[PDB]
């Protein structure tokens, strides 16, 4: 087998920018190098193949070079539909061997978070469980903290977060925070908030409401 | 237009065997090799196998020699994967492409859709419980408002979540799945809308999870 | 290559050698045939010629190849060389120093090789 | 001289699979191969099936060839009204004295079409051919289906017999219905007897039997 | 493009020589790999394969046939030639020129015949002689008259050999046309019908001819169908 090593694993660059990544190969596989791109949510996409040939319908701004050992690929003008991993992958000797992959990730201008509330709903009251979420629309940088507060006490433990993949359009993320109670404890407060804490956001925003 | 639609997701449980299907079109089915791909959660590539639609012949790497069987019928132009002797570490998105080839180079234009098996000592595919994340900031929803569904509880994964059957997909957020403390997955997809619209224009929400055959819509309108 | 072709051909008819096979799009292929006149006699052979092509697939477009090399052993009898073209040898006027055994090898890009042996003789008269 | 056996006819309604059979010895199908022929009556053959399985181009991938020992087999998968013709298989005999052996032939006839009733026309005898002291009475049935019809030739409500002729068209490309000619060669002598001449015809598609009369005129 | 004709169809008295030629157009007899054939089919006797010449002169002949068949190409002018001898009635059938192509495989020798030529009717009778047809006008009238078409025709009577050949204004009219088969008479005579349905609202409006080849006895008849007086 032919083991080939990407590198970096992980770069973080600007839209208007020159991005490499590399690919090295335990021995030498000729022309016989591709490169793949895959979106989050889809299957991975070819972009060059033959070291240097150009698939149909991928943009211009993607080059590739190298022979044998080392290989390049070239982003020139770096957009925000970029956004992907790639992976490299030998055409020379069966088995076929892929790269570990490279992410890139589109450095944005700093964006707030848009916070909502959402109170639980009746039908998953009736069960006994009471889901209160609380969501950040489209912010950059994805660092951002989401404390909440159930009656003004500092909540912990019983909330779980979740975050989107970067926006192929405006570079942004989103986040989910999942306050999880149960349904008497719920019903026993009053007072629900999500303190929202971002680079974007000069004061903490808080969104709250009232119901138990 | 070259079409690879593989089979639905499955649960399976360890020392089962896997059988995923690949049916082709828009293209001479016996002058393009197809091959197979595995993506485990969170991790990169790995081949599978190759296989020749006309001499049903094929090649497979040495992790998987012997446990690992690729067949074809070129009647129903569909080619089969089977996966012996399954283990936790099999768990992953396995896919199935053709293979275009100029001299000696070899890539794979056209890729399947993905069918992800999951290899758990579970018995029983738990339908996900959709809930509404309803609409009203007080009845106060200045500028944009957002809206959602919460799958509360499914296994296996995935949950495909649409909205409006399709026709709405600008700034439809569907959140990463969370695994909970029960074993099982739980997710939320948000949308954000003109406020303008929340009294005029039905939202619902299209959650399908194929492990369990389970199609669920469901329509979220402000609480009154 | 299961195993021997047998061809009965009538004197001085011709006879077409035929290897058939689906090719992949892209592919680049290679094809040698060689000639054993053990028949006539009374890992060396005769390449009658090597041949070498890329598959177009079309069904239809004609396939052009190139023609790497061909042995002069039929001249140097003053016969006329074999017709050869992808998966075809072909012979205008059987005759004595056309009997014996044809190879026909196939190697592509895909890692495929492929053989065919052939034993062309004379119907009634063995 | 040697012939391959076939069925005489095979038949189907529209959509069916219908397999056609050609049986032969160890000189001929056993160590060659076989090849199927297609023929539209009043037009030459035309091939739809070499080296025992390999299609021409313009030959719909639903017409199949199959061969095992000493037979061999064709295919019609989804039977269409363009289908119905006379089917042929063939292969070489080499022995000592080579030939190439041809089927007895296999007639696919489509079933389950529209029963189209005759439309019957009387034309009476024409001129320059009573000058010649010979009339002809013609009766055309033009667009119909099944084959089978009959014409009686009344006259004077007295059935003519053993004098008529009767032609039949193979069915139209276009729309597969059958067109017959019953022309009544009754001579002069006996056709001055009178004017009075009718056809009568009797069809599947006719709830009662159609009469053309010429009186008069 | 590549296209096989005959020579034409004509009465041969039994126990003569019948000689048919082939020309090819859309290429030359020089290619590789093809056999130039005849077969024949006679109504009733399915199809028979008489023999194939090659490029170099090498042949093959139907067994039952090799005393009296005789085969010759000639490259210069693309054309290939059958000679049959000792000819009797049961000889009389369509005689088809075809190309065929011909190879060895792992199947076995395979010999098909691809692209075929049109058919002539030689007839091998001394029953009758040759003799010009006598076309004869099935004249209309106002059939289907309750809301309908209506039919005219012409009546071919008195041709020998066969075969002949109907069109309707010269080629103009061919929906339907519906030329019927040919009756053998007593007077050891063919006769044949060619009918065509028209609107009524064509009758007196339209002019219809009908053009008969009798290549045998090199006559052509043309005759024009008129509505009868009354009508």
Not at chain 2, 46 to 55: D, K, M, T
Not at chain 2, 99 to 108: H, Q
Request: hydrophobic share 30%.
């Amino acid at each position: 087998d032919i083991q080939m090593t990407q590198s970096p694993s992980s770069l973080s660059a600007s839209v208007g920018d020159r991005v490499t990544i590399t690919c090295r190969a335990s021995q030498s596989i000729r022309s016989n190098l591709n490169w793949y791109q895959q979106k989050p949510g889809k299957a991975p996409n070819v972009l060059i193949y033959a070291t240097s040939s150009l698939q149909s319908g991928v943009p211009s701004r993607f080059s590739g070079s190298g022979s044998g050992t080392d290989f390049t690929l070239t982003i020139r003008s770096l957009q925000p539909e970029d956004f992907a991993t790639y992976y490299c992958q030998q055409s020379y000797s069966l088995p076929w061997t892929f790269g570990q992959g490279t992410k890139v990730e589109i450095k944005r201008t700093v964006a707030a978070p848009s916070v909502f509330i959402f109170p639980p709903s009746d039908e998953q009251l009736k069960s006994g469980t009471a889901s209160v979420v609380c969501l950040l629309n489209n912010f950059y940088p994805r660092e951002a903290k989401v404390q909440w507060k159930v009656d003004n006490a500092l909540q912990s433990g019983n909330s779980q977060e979740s975050v989107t993949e970067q926006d192929s359009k405006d570079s942004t993320y989103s986040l989910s925070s999942t306050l999880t109670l149960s349904k008497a404890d719920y019903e026993k407060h009053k007072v629900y908030a999500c303190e929202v804490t971002h680079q974007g956001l000069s004061s903490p925003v808080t969104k709250s409401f009232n119901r138990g | 237009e070259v079409q690879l639609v593989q089979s639905g997701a499955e649960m399976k449980k360890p020392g089962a065997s896997v059988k995923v299907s690949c049916k082709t079109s828009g293209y001479v089915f016996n002058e393009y090799y197809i091959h197979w791909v595995r993506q485990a959660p969170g991790q990169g590539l790995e081949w599978l196998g190759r296989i020749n639609p006309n001499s049903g012949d094929a090649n497979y790497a040495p992790k998987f020699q012997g446990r690992v069987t690729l067949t074809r019928d070129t009647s129903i132009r569909t080619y089969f994967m089977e996966l012996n002797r399954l283990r936790s570490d099999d768990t992953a998105v396995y896919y199935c492409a053709r293979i275009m080839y100029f001299e000696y180079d070899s890539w794979s234009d056209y890729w399947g859709q993905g069918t992800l098996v999951t290899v758990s000592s579970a018995a029983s595919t738990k339908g996900p419980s959709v809930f509404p994340l309803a609409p009203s900031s007080k009845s106060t929803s200045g500028g944009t408002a957002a809206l959602g569904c919460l799958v509360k509880d499914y296994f296996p994964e995935p949950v495909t979540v649409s909205w409006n059957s399709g026709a709405l997909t600008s700034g439809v957020h569907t959140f990463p799945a969370v695994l909970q403390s029960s074993g099982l997955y739980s997710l939320s997809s948000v949308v954000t809308v003109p406020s303008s619209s929340l009294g005029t224009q039905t939202y619902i929400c299209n959650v399908n999870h194929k492990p369990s055959n389970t199609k669920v819509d469901k329509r979220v309108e402000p609480k009154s | 290559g299961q195993r021997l072709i047998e061809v009965s051909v009538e004197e001085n008819h011709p006879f077409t050698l035929r290897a058939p096979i689906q090719r992949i799009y892209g592919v680049r292929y290679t094809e040698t045939w060689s000639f054993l006149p053990s028949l006539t006699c009374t890992t060396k052979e005769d390449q009658l010629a090597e041949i070498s092509y890329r598959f177009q697939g079309k069904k239809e477009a004609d396939q052009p190849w190139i023609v790497v090399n061909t042995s002069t052993l039929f001249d140097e009898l003053e016969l006329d060389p074999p017709e050869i073209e992808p998966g075809v040898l072909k012979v205008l006027r059987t005759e004595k120093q056309y009997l014996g055994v044809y190879i026909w090898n196939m190697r592509g890009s895909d890692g495929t090789s492929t053989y065919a042996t052939f034993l062309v003789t004379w119907k009634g008269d063995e | 001289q040697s012939v391959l056996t076939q069925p005489p006819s095979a038949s189907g309604t529209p959509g069916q699979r219908v397999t056609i059979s050609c049986s032969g010895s160890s000189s001929d199908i056993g160590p060659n191969t076989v090849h199927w022929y297609r023929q539209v009556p009043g037009t030459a053959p035309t091939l739809l099936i070499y080296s025992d399985n390999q299609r021409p181009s313009g030959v719909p991938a639903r017409f199949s060839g199959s061969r095992s020992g000493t037979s061999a087999s064709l295919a019609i998968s989804g039977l269409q009204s363009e289908d119905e013709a006379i089917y042929y298989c063939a292969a070489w005999d080499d022995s000592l004295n080579p030939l190439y052996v041809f089927g007895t032939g296999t007639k696919v006839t489509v079933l389950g079409r529209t029963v189209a009733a005759p439309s019957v026309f009387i034309f009476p005898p024409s001129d320059e051919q009573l000058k010649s002291g010979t009339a002809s009475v013609v009766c055309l049935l033009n667009n119909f289906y099944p084959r089978e019809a009959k014409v009686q030739w009344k006259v004077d409500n007295a059935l003519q017999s053993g004098n008529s002729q009767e032609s039949v068209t193979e069915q139209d490309s276009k729309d597969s219905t059958y067109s017959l000619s019953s022309t009544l060669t009754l001579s002069k002598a006996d056709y001055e007897k009178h004017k009075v001449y009718a056809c009568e015809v009797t069809h599947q598609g006719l709830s009662s039997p159609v009469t053309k009369s010429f009186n008069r005129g």
